[PDB]
Amino acid sequence: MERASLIQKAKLAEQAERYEDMAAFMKGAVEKGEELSCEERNLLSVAYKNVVGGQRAAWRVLSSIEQKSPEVREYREKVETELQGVCDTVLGLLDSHLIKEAGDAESRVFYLKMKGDYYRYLAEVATGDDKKRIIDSARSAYQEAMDISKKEMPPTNPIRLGLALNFSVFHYEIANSPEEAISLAKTTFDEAMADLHTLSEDSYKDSTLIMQLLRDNLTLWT
Amino acid sequence: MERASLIQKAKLAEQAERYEDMAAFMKGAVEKGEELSCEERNLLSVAYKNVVGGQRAAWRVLSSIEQKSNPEVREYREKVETELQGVCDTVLGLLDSHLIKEAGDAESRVFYLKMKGDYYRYLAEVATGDDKKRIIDSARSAYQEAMDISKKEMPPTNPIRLGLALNFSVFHYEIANSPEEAISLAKTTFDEAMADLHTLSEDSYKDSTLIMQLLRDNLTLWT
Amino acid sequence: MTGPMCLIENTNGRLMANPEALKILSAITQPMVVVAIVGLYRTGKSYLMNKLADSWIFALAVLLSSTFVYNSIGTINQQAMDQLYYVTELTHRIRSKSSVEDSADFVSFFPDFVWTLRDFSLDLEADGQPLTPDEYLTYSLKLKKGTSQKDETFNLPRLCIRKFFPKKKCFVFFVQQVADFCSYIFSNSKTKTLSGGIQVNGPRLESLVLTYVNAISSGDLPCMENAVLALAQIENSAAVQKAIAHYEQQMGQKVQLPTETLQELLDLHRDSEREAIEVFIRSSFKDVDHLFQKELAAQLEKKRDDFCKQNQEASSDRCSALLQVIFSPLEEEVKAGIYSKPGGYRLFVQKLQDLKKKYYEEPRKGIQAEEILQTYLKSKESMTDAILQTDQTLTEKEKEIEVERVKAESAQASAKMLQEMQRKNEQMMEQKERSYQEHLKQLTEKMENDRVQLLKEQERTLALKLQEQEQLLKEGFQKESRIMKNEIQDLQTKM
């Protein structure tokens, strides 16, 4: 069908809270060849975030049941495999349709951050060596997004903050470096506050919510 | 795989909140040919109920958005319908080609006929024209048969009897368009439950009390 | 009160309790049903409250009331629900305990909710028959399917009202509608209660006001748990004082010093102590670590020691006095030589035995009777021998017999004194153990009663949450219904 309607069905999907359908529509809209607008971009991460979120939660529930004293493992693996399917789909979509397929610094950072997040999820369920490879491909994506944000965006831009937030989660929960996670989260927060004045009602609500998430993490981490 | 492990996976799936997987695990269990225990029957209904609960809520969003009448929106709603019907259909096959009558005790018999009434009811919601009429009939006959058995085999306080009565009344109001009949059933079902509760120990008091509340809430909202 | 008074002042951005109002509250000892009204300004709130006769104000109204009346003009539409952010914001203003989930406890202590809709413009017409205002409220709080930001915003305040308040009621508004609202309040509003079934009266409400306002003034969040504990500190301290007062009163009205025996005094102590502990137990609550009861125990022990000292002193005085009255005349007769004549030993021993008998027959000598007598008799031992050896009417063999008889009687007197001493120590030890067991007994009984009361409260919360879970499922919302099951599991870990 037409890109215009694909976009329309995703909005409907999100309304009816049918994220799997929503992610599929967006995927069809992406393969249409044309770049996505800011609005479209968010539809894409919201759809896939919800789909993958359910699987990640399922996985965590199961793996904990497995560790806490045959079926558990077999089922955890099924969920895990299904989760890796989605991540490879998102990553493929990014590598051959979205990443640097545009010009804007915001669109570029957004896509590279998304690449970091999905490699990060793949890292949550991987084991020895395969994990090291995945972890390193996650970091290079975050770092490249970080380099672009620090040169192209003010310290309060919500995308830059979302990126810095998730990159700190990466340091703490994946790269096993609590030290680095805490300082980046703290450094991102301060430089954010120090500019909050006249942050324009534009991205106010978003950056404000991410700033709170940064704090929650700092508290939980310390 | 072994029935026992299918049941275990259904329980793991429930904890993982993967109802679709759960439903498929209970379906495998049901196909083993052995009767379901009380706990197992509840696992089966929780599964499919959650699966269908999601499609319904989605269909109800897409419908109001469409406004029942006043492109894309139409096409997507129809797809959600097809899906809902698919789930309802496999539940009905499970009941008609396995669970119904292959059971002995009154409880289970009423439980499956109730379930049968429940899913024909979900099919009715998304049906129009004469299709809805035929569906409403088969839903009514299943609920009635369940009602005939509960009135004959169980006491006014049995939670399952109350549930059936509750759902049957909902059917009369939301589907059969017969409010009065829906109200009288609920009233009677509730009263008869009271004048017998003075002897109902917490050994099941909690159960009935929970459902009795739902009957009055509906009674209150229908008035 | 001839008329209303400001309870909490709001000046220059600061909320502060009015001392004059707190004073009035301290004087009202009867149980209170508290009804608070909130809503947009100029909506006829004060007018309606006379018929019955921002975020912090809203939160305080929730914390202090039995029934919370939210008043608005019009219908329950999007515009009206946007104003209910004040309810959603309660999760950021109120803390249930201090020891996304804390709000799961709100339904256990929040007031019943009543929505009063003024200048109502709908006929509520519906197929068959019209909706009642309560059914209209149910209709208005139904959720919308979807996960969009718009959907979440629509559902949030509705979910908060449905999940935070234990009961909901709606009234639309005219003279008869006001009459029906007042009748409902007068018949359904419950006495304000705190965890443990504690009924709030004037002094208790005063405490809550001070604690919550002080918290807000400190830049902290008002916490229900902290308020109950703060109240406990006050009442438990008073309970210890009341119990000690009761002990002192009972002992004073019944003790007669010196007591006939130590058992007499300890029996009275035990009885008074049991009554005192009962006074404390019924007047206290939330005595964490039993610190207050331990303080009471320490004070009663000191009180017991004081009575024992007074008793021993009273006995010593009485017995020493009797010694002077009974034996002094004999000592002087002996020193005067009255028994230094032929046959005087027999007369002396007979007199001495008669005097010892007299001493023993004197009433209520007390716990020092044997020690006082024996110490005296031993110190004057030489007197007997002096008279014996002097008497010539007694053969030497007879004197030898008497010396051995006197030695045996001295040993028996010593045994009476030694036993008196040993028995007293045993009785003190036994009383110590009995007192300890009495405290344990009453404490175990109170803890059992507290456990039952808490479980009862938890069962009510469980019933309310199960009810909502079912409504959500029946309504078709599994995502939210499943979230309820989560809160239910967490509640059950506490039971």
Numbering used by the authors:
A (entry chain B): 1 to 69, 79 to 231
B (entry chain C): 1 to 70, 79 to 231
C (entry chain A): 7 to 59, 112 to 157, 165 to 238, 262 to 583
Authors' own words:
Human GBP1 is a membrane-active large GTPase that can disrupt microbe-encapsulating membranes. GBP1 has a C-terminal prenylation site that enables its membrane association and forms homo-/hetero-dimers and membrane-bound coatomers with itself or with other GBPs. Here we found that a large fraction of GBP1 is phosphorylated by the kinase PIM1 at Ser156, establishing that post-translational modification of human GBP1 regulates its activity. Ser156-phosphorylated GBP1 was sequestered in the cytosol by 14-3-3σ, thereby preventing self-inflicted damage, in a mechanism reminiscent of how Rnd3 GTPase is inactivated.
Ser156 of GBP1 is part of a flexible, surface-exposed loop and is the central serine of a putative, evolutionarily conserved mode I 14-3-3 binding motif. To visualize the interaction between phosphorylated GBP1 and 14-3-3σ, we solved the structure of the purified protein complex using single particle cryogenic electron microscopy (cryo-EM). We obtained a cryo-EM map of the GBP1:14-3-3 heterotrimer at 5 Å resolution, confirming binding of one 14-3-3σ homodimer to a single copy of GBP1 by grabbing its GTPase domain and interacting with the linker helix that connects the helical domain to the GTPase domain. While the overall resolution did not permit de novo modelling, we were able to unambiguously dock previously reported crystal structures as rigid bodies based on secondary structure features. Furthermore, 14-3-3σ helices 5+9 were in contact with the parallel-running linker helix of GBP1. For GBP1, both Ser156 and Thr590 would be involved in sequential two-step 14-3-3-binding, with the initial recognition by Ser156 and subsequent stabilization by binding to Thr590. In summary, our model suggests that phosphorylated GBP1 is sequestered by 14-3-3σ, acting as a molecular padlock to keep the protein inactive through inhibition of dimerization and GTPase-activity.
